[PDB]
Structures are given as C-alpha cells and as structure tokens.
Amino acid sequence: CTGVRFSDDEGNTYFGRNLDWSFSYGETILVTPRGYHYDTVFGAGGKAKPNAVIGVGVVMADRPMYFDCANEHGLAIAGLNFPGYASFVHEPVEGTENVATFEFPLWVARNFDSVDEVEETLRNVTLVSQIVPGQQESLLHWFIGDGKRSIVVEQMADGMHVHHDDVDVLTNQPTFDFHMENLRNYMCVSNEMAEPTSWGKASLTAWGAGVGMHGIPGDVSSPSRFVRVAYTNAHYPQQNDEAANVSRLFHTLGSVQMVDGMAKMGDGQFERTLFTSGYSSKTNTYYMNTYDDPAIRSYAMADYDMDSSELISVA
Amino acid sequence: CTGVRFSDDEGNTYFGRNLDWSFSYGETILVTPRGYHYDTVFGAGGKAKPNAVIGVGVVMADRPMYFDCANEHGLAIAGLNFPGYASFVHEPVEGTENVATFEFPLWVARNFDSVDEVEETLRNVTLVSQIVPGQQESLLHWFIGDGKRSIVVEQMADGMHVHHDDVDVLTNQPTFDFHMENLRNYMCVSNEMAEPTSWGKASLTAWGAGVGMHGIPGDVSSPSRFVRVAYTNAHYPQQNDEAANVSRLFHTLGSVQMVDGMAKMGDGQFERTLFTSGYSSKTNTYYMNTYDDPAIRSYAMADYDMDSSELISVAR
Amino acid sequence: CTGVRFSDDEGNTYFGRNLDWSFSYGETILVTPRGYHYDTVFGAGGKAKPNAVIGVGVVMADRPMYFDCANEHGLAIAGLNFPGYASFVHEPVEGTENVATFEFPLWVARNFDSVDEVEETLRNVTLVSQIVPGQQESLLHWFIGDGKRSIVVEQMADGMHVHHDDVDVLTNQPTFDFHMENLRNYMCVSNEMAEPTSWGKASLTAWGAGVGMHGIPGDVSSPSRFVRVAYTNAHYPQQNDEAANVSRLFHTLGSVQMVDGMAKMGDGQFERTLFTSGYSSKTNTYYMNTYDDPAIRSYAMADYDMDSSELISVAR
Amino acid sequence: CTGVRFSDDEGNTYFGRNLDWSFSYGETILVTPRGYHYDTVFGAGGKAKPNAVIGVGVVMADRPMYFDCANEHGLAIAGLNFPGYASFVHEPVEGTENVATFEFPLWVARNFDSVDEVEETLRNVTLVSQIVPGQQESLLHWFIGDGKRSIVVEQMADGMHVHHDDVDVLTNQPTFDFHMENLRNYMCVSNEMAEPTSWGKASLTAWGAGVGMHGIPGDVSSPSRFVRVAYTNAHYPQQNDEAANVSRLFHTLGSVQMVDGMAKMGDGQFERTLFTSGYSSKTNTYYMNTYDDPAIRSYAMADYDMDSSELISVAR
Ligand SMILES: *CC(=O)CC[C@@H](C)[C@H]1CC[C@H]2[C@@H]3CC[C@@H]4C[C@H](OS(=O)(=O)O)CC[C@]4(C)[C@H]3CC[C@]12C
Ligand SMILES: *CC(=O)CC[C@@H](C)[C@H]1CC[C@H]2[C@@H]3CC[C@@H]4C[C@H](OS(=O)(=O)O)CC[C@]4(C)[C@H]3CC[C@]12C
C-alpha cells in the first residue's frame, strides 16, 4: 500500500491510498453519519457532537472497519501493513485513552478536526489489539493528514512513535526512519533536463526527458515505492482546482501501482492495486476507482443525511 | 512514448501506445472508411478495395495523419519519436514503392492484412521524408504488430532495419538492438517471492512482494521505460476475455506512464502521458483515455459507416 | 572507512581496515609493550599484566592514540567516523567504568581476550568525550572482532548500542540497523553464472561473469560501500593458509577502495584510501600498504621486545 | 578484462590492462628485440628496422604471442575477449595486408609509431583467424593507445569497425557503441559533494563523500565495468611524474578488479584479476603485479639487449 497527501493554493486537503493485495475484502464506500451511536470498545473518550465520516471499509458486528476514512473538516487517515514491526498490547492500560486498532481510523475521524489535535491526544493513547472473529490480527501503521501536514503513527514493541511526515507519503516496512534515511541516496536525481557534460573526451547528452531522474528504483517493493512516490509527490506542480488536484492524486498514486504479474506474495498469488481511494476537503468528496474500472467514481458528503443514525454502504 | 502488443488464447491482436509529450496537436479518434479515396504522395500502389481503418490522428490537407491506427483484419501500427537516429531520403526512388513518412501508417493499415505481408513488401519500400519549409521534419520509427508478432521499422542513414520484436515492446532512442542488449543486464530479475538466503551469518528475508523485481529502473527515460514495460508485458498473466485483455493493455502501458513533474523537456515544459490508445482485433474496437480522464472509451468499427467516403472525427 | 573480519578453518582472526581521508596525520605502526605503564584518564580498571598491543596510530602526550589495534590473543578493534549520530557524555559516571573515547581501542586491546569479554563488561562502560579546547570533537563508532565473531559499538544519544555484526563488516553513517535493513534490497544477487531465461519470446543470456551480481551499488558512499563489501566478504571462498588469507583481506577491503578523483569531501578535497591495515592472529602480525605503495609490509609482534616499557613507533 | 589509457602534461603514454580469467596460461614478461626476425604468417609487410617491443604474453612455435605489448615510441595495444561478436575470415584477401589474429599485437607494435598511423593502415588490413585443431579459435577485440588518444578495433561479420575511444577505456561485450550509448544513463553522476536539496518540506543532505557518485553500478559484468572504469579514468586528477602516474594507472584498473568469489564463469570457477600490467612511454618501462603479490614489478626496456635477435623472457 501507498498513502499520499498534498495541499492546494487554499489549504485544502487531498489524500489517498493504494490498496495492494491478492484478494478483495468486499470493502465498500462507507458513510457513518453524526447521529450514528457508537460505543468504543475500551470506553475511549469522544466528542459530544461527533463528525460526519466517509471512507472505504467493511462492517463487522455493526461497526465500521475503515480501511481509510475522512471527516467533514479535512482530516483523513489510512491504515497500511506493518508486520514484523508493529506490536500492540492486548490489555487496556488505565489512565490512558484505550482505542482498539480496528477502531482507530473511525475514532480519529469522529473526534478530531486537525493533525494538531491528533498529535496531542495520541500523547496519552494506548493502541490495543483485540482479535476480530475469524481474521488474523492486523499489524498496521497509520498515515494521518489534514490540509497542512501529515504524521505517521507506528506503534512498535518499544512504544509508539509519531513522526512528522515531511514527504507527505507512506508505504510499508521497514521503519519510517529507514525510509527517510534511504531518501538521501537519491538526493541528486532531478526533474530538470540532464545538463550536457563530458567524461574526458566523450560528450554526454541525454536522449530526451527522464535521464536526470535516472536512479529512482522501479520495483514494487515497499522501500522502492516509498522513494518513487515521494519523488513524484514532491515534484508535481501545485494545482488550483478540484479536477486537476484529483487528477494529481490518482496519477501520483498511479506512479507506484502494482500490475498483475509483477510480484508474487508468500501465498504464491500476485499482489495488485485492487482499488485507489481518495478524499478532497474542498468539496468533502470521496473518490475511488478499481483495477477493472479506472473511471473515477465520486461520493460526496452533501448527498447523504449526515444526521442519520445508521451506517450506509454504497455498492 | 511506448508501444505494447500481446495476444490472447484465440490469437487476437491487442495493441496500444502511450503518447508522452508536452502539448497536444488536437489529435482525435479518426475513422478512414473504405470509400474514402486517397492518393499516395509518390504513387505507391495498394488494395483496390482498401481496408477500413480506425485510429488516432489529425487531418491535414484533407489527408488523415495517424499517430497510430489499425485495420479490420487485426493489423496495427504506431509512430514513435526517433530523432537523432531516424534518417530518410528526401526524393523518391524509381522501381520501389515510395511512401511518405506521414502516410506510412495509413498506407500500411489500408493495404496489408498481416505482419508477414508488411515485412515482405518492405524489402522494396522507400520511406521518403518530404521537406516542408516552415516545419521540422517528423523523425519516427514504427511499431507494427498483429495477432502473432510485431516488428520494428527503423529507417536510418545506413538503410532500413526491420527487427523481429520478441518482447512486443518499443519506446524511443536509441536503436532497437541497444534495447535488446540492455535487457540482459536485468535477466536475473524475477516476479517470484524472494527466496530467503544468508550472507555469512546474516539471514536475509524480504519484507514482502517486489524484492525479486529489484534492479528494474523507475525513471521515465526511453531506455528505462523499455526495460520496465518489457518486464511487465512478459510477466503479465494471459487473459481470456475482452475486458480483462483491454484492462491488461492499459495497465501494462500505465507502468511506464509519465506523470506531471517527473521530467522536463529541452524547452522547459514537463513531459506527460497525454493519452493512451488501444486496439483489439477480437471486436475491431479502438480504445482511449486521457491524462485528465482515466475512463477508457471505446470506438468500435461497427459504429461507423465504413462504406462511406468521408473521414469521421470525434473530438474531445 | 571500511572494516572487515573473517576467520580461517582453524579459528584465527583476520581483521582489516581501510582509512579513507583527504590527508594523513602522521600515523605509523605503533607498538605498546606489556611493560609500558598507562594511567586510564578516568581510572578505568584493567588487567594487572596487560596484553601486548600493536596497531596504527599516533602519539599525543605520550599516549597511544590508535586508529586500529590488536592484541596478542586475537582481539582487534578499529575506530571509524560516526558524526551526526555519535553522541557521548562529557563527564564520568559514578559506579561505572568510565573510558575516554580516544583510549577505548587501547583499553579494549590491553585488558580483554575475546569479544565475549568485551561485550560483557561493556554493559557497565561509560564513554566520555574529553574536548580539547582548541580541537573539534572526535565522534567515532568502533568495530571489534576476534576469531569467532564481531560486534559494533555505536554510542548515541539514546544510550550505547552493541550489535552482533553477522556480516562482519562496518562502514560509516547512518546507524548499523539501517545498513542491515538495506541489505535486504540486494538479497537476490548471486555470484553464480546467470541462468538463461526468457521474457516472452526474447531469450536472455549473460555475456559472461558478473551479471548475477547486477544490483550491487558501485559508488563510494557509506551505505553503498557497506553493501558491496558485505557481499564480497560473504562470498569469498575460505582459505587455509596465511598468505592466501592476508590476500583475501586486502582484496575484500580493496573492493571498496576510494580512488583519487572519485568523490570530493566538504572542503573540496578528494577522499582516498590513504592506507590499508590488517592483522592476523595465526602469526600475531600487522600488515599495511598505502595509496602510494601497494606492496604489503608485515610487522610481527615477535620482532619487538613486548616486555619493554616504551612506545615503539615504526617509521618508513 | 579492462583496458585503460591516459596521459600527463607532457604527452607521455600511460597504458594498462587487467587480466580476468579462471586460470593462467603461463604468460610472462616478453621482450622482442629489433634484431629478432619475424616472418608474418600471411606476408604482411612491415618496417625494415622494426621497433623494440615488450609486454606480457606466451611463446608458441618461436612466435611471440602477446596479451598486451608496447613499443619504444609510446604505442601500446592489448587484446580483450570478444566472443559472440568477433567474427573473422579464415582466408587471406588479395590486395590487402593479411594479418593473423595472434600476431596482430606484435605486428602493430613492431611496425607503427602512433595511433594515427595504425588507423590509416587498418583501412587495407584483413584480420585472418588461423585456427588450430586442438585449441578453440580466439575471438578478441583490441585496445590501441599512445600519448594522444586511443582506438578500438572490433572485427565483426559485417566488417571491421575502428572507433575513436573518447573515454580511453575498453572492456568486453557487447559492441563499443553500446557502451558509449550506455554511458548516457549515468551522465548525471558527479564527484562533487552532493548539494543539500529538498523534496517538499523534507531536507536531504549527504552523510559524507560519494553520494554524488550514486548510480554507478558495482557488479563485475562487462557493461558495468565499462561504466565504472570510464568514470574513474575521466575524473582522476592529472599527475606530472612517473610514480604518481603508475599509481594512477593501477588504482584506476583496481576500481574494476575481480575479487575471488564475486562471479563464476560458465564452467563453475570464479574469475579473478590474475595480473595487472602497465606501460609508461616516459621511461619505456613495463609494470606488473598479480592477485597474489600487489607489489608492482618494473621491467625497463633499457635493461635488455634491444639489438639482439632472440626473444627474452622473465620466468614467473
Ligand atoms: C495496505 C496494506 O498492505 C494492509 C493490508 C490490508 C489487507 C489491510 C488494510 C486495512 C485492513 C482492514 C482494516 C479494518 C479491519 C481491521 C481488523 O484488525 S484487527 O482488529 O487487528 O483484527 C482486521 C479486519 C480488517 C477488515 C482489516 C483487514 C486487512 C486490511 C484490509
Ligand atoms: C512520444 C513520442 O515519441 C513523440 C511522438 C510525437 C512527437 C509524434 C508521433 C506522431 C507525430 C505526428 C504524425 C502526423 C503528422 C506528421 C507531420 O510531419 S510531416 O511528415 O512533415 O507532415 C507533422 C505533424 C504530425 C501531426 C506529427 C507530429 C508529431 C507526432 C505527434
């Protein structure tokens, strides 16, 4: 998986993720309105009037299990695989806000309006792993971003690390610190035209565009996707309207797309970008296309009764 | 730019290309019906009953100028920029089928039904580059394929090279032989899960998928795009239906897409995949999507009066 | 700078060190005899009868400042630059064995006989940085190895980290955990001849040796050097005698040599492997050659009065 | 293998090569004096007063068969493996200078005084490959240099190609124009300290020296060795004395040395830099070290009877 965040001229949020896996989970566009009554698993605090929330996920035990979601105030969050590094406790800790791992995305989007608020509240949060019936435990880290910045939440054996995501991007293993250090190997690549030069008597000129970008890895592994999508996201010209920014989002995530036949998993099946999701705070709209249908479908917040009380799943 | 070709179990053609440029020429889905009368520039002959042709291009001086086109019999062709390597004569040659460079895609699609036919008649073809004063000359090489195989036509100062394209893939500079030699650098790359191993006492395991693919370049230069798209086309599992094959073709071309901001051209503007076209001989249908809209449109030959005599265009 | 350790089939120590810098500091072969009296700066406790020690370094205030050194029992230690990550305290700690950073190599070699002994007492060692007012601060990390295994000592702000160096290799920045994670990118390279394979119809064969090794970086940066020399150390065939093992040591280190003109440092000067030092516990001998003289020169412990009381600096 | 040429401020020749193989042929330093009489296999003419020649090679049928050699006027030549591309006729051609492949280095060194002269004569030269029934036929290309420039001689099925070697460097397969095209992939690497930049809000800096060099491949394949040694040869600062330039010649070739264990060849054995030989026109001296002894041995032309009439050889 790959998560991307960027802003426009007016401070709006643009946020999206690739879902790379070998099979579908039957996920769907999921709307949890403000009047929906939710009881947190470990009695975690919340807001009196919660926020409207839309995203992609599944429903289990009448609870919205969000793969990624956003609220009506420009805050969004996604969950990405982190096994071999993620480590959670299975028992609540008193004195802290105990949140189940599956409910962390819904909890963030419902009770907070900014990355600033999330960062301070996390200073007293215990992420507790409670096994869900029939599914092996998920070992994830989270990518949270608003209109100004993004953070990475990596709960590991030695505690919880909250990183300032200066590249506004995230993938999978290994640690976020490794990925930021790894970027320094590629610090000389450029999107400019390769300047003509000579090695001794040999004159060197580029055939055309892209030679200055040589060095960027092309494989679909987690560290290489991080470098590729960080370069793409950092060099994309800033856009100023909804359609162009949504186009920027899906094209940036498309730069690290996983095509059928590229890479097998431990199971022996090919991992592929099953769907690409996205959110815009300028219009409070969720966007999505799939591997079999690249046409971007839109799901606005303003055409669902956000005061209703039941979960809405749009096929 | 990048050309891609593959087939299904039934032997149907699947052909497409990315167009990566900094601006648009106003190109458009263009239909050349059988009844449209065309006069070759230097009198090259062809079918008395030409084939129906659909593709993407422009109309100049009432002539259809195709960027890439296909016919009703499963033969397709694409023109890709080849400056610094492409070289043509400026005057025709007596005794040979002299074809202008801009009319080469149309002339191939109208008069030939297979790649074997094109390769045979190319042994007596002279590609003439007509000199237009107030415009630079188009310096292209071509990617021609049907249901069975593809070939690369690279006309250079030392003659016309017709290559058997075993990777079913083409980009830009340099010569095709360079690209085929360059793939040998990456012959150890694999799409399998990286097998655990040891360096001395240190056990090495992959974080997950993709580590066996390590070594493939990710830049948008012409040589790196050749390797990445040849890897993807060769390792893509064979598909059974039209929807899966059309989705395979666009996803294959999407692996070497040029995103805004990645690379500037000599004149300062970024190079982007403005559009991606496709063709399927199973339904004789052209496909296309754009940088501003990823939805794949379809344009079947069955939806146009192929017996008419006027070029049909559908703008964007 | 690169450090390399390996062992023969008899359990002997082979320890090597590249010193990559832009100028020399006057270092020579420096012998510290068993009868030489030395007072630890912060009163750290050592052996009653110290070990004989030989290595490369300078003499400051009649104190052996060792770049790298080994003892008569097969234990060796090398200091390599670690600025930007190395952070020490400036005052001693009560109840701990406080060791100054500049004396850590001499302290390790004189008082210990294996990496097990070193790793054990390191759980109570505090490395202190005594800043000379006119000089800048020395910020190093250390590579310690014997005949069985090696460890890496990286003292940082969040404490002292002691790593089990399973690749028996150390370079420079960043932390050792990064380098070991980084190796997982290259786990698919191979010293075997690349097996012929096919991409679609394209048959791919290697021109010759080395194609299975494609992927290994070739630049002289710190992470790229770690990857390249860890690959070479892990794939070097085992040697039985001494001359071949000393040859293995200098060829492995030579795989990541810094040639003049390859890379400029901050001051605009070029960085070069000024000398390459080595040690063999089978013969208790130090070896060394320089950028200007590739001939390896030996300095045997049995050639010096190890019972004397004066530092012996060997010139020429 | 790898060939390398460069010069100093006074225009002297500095020429050398690595020998990478799985075994040795018993070759030695080999002096061919002027008085030695040589009857060319196919009647190729030459000077009345031949030049004195020295190099590394073997003696077969009282003929000196050099791996690499140089004459007293500063002209050198080496032969490097080229199977799969090298193709020779097996019969002489009337009207030309028919030179056998094994006598090509000696013929060039004994009869010509500059690269300019060899270039002019090669226009009427036929490279004839005379095969023996026991051994396999040698398929090589040649690296010829002097105090000014170097050229590459690649005899192939479609004729003989003589390239101007702008990088003054040669390795093995594929063709020379592939390697010169391939260098363009790396045109952005630099020996300068990487300049601090930013990706968005993230500030990127180099750990130290060598990050600007990131991109150069580190494997021992023929294409990767070409890129890495061309880079190293091109950025080495010029030197103006014999000792500094012999050091440069061996350090530059050492940047593409084959270390034991890096890569197996077709028959399962590891390939290694068995010896590294060099030549200097300033002193008319041949140099040589080996995998086992890095000490550089010198063999001056003025230490042999260049007026004698029999081959002189230096055992081991
Ligand atoms: C992006 C990745 O590579 C991550 C793997 C992918 C299969 C994940 C992404 C989101 C997950 C779901 C999130 C919602 C719940 C969480 C539950 O976690 S648990 O409580 O620890 O068991 C498990 C079920 C489910 C539906 C996750 C399934 C796996 C994911 C789709
Ligand atoms: C990604 C690439 O390789 C770039 C290719 C692009 C610049 C080319 C490909 C097809 C060309 C057009 C072909 C039709 C006509 C031909 C005219 O040349 S002429 O023969 O002198 O008349 C020039 C105009 C046009 C529309 C070409 C323009 C360049 C291309 C779009």
Ligand SMILES: *CC(=O)CC[C@@H](C)[C@H]1CC[C@H]2[C@@H]3CC[C@@H]4C[C@H](OS(=O)(=O)O)CC[C@]4(C)[C@H]3CC[C@]12C
């Ligand atoms: C290739 C590299 O990583 C560069 C390392 C190089 C700069 C270091 C390595 C060993 C150092 C010497 C160690 C011995 C003493 C320690 C003294 O510490 S201080 O007195 O507290 O400053 C400084 C001098 C000296 C000789 C070190 C000099 C630098 C090194 C050669």
Ligand SMILES: *CC(=O)CC[C@@H](C)[C@H]1CC[C@H]2[C@@H]3CC[C@@H]4C[C@H](OS(=O)(=O)O)CC[C@]4(C)[C@H]3CC[C@]12C
């Ligand atoms: C690293 C390399 O590319 C070196 C390749 C190596 C195997 C070659 C290079 C020089 C060759 C020798 C040249 C002298 C003679 C030539 C004879 O030619 S033949 O008679 O036509 O067969 C063969 C023997 C010998 C000694 C060559 C052997 C192969 C090489 C050492």
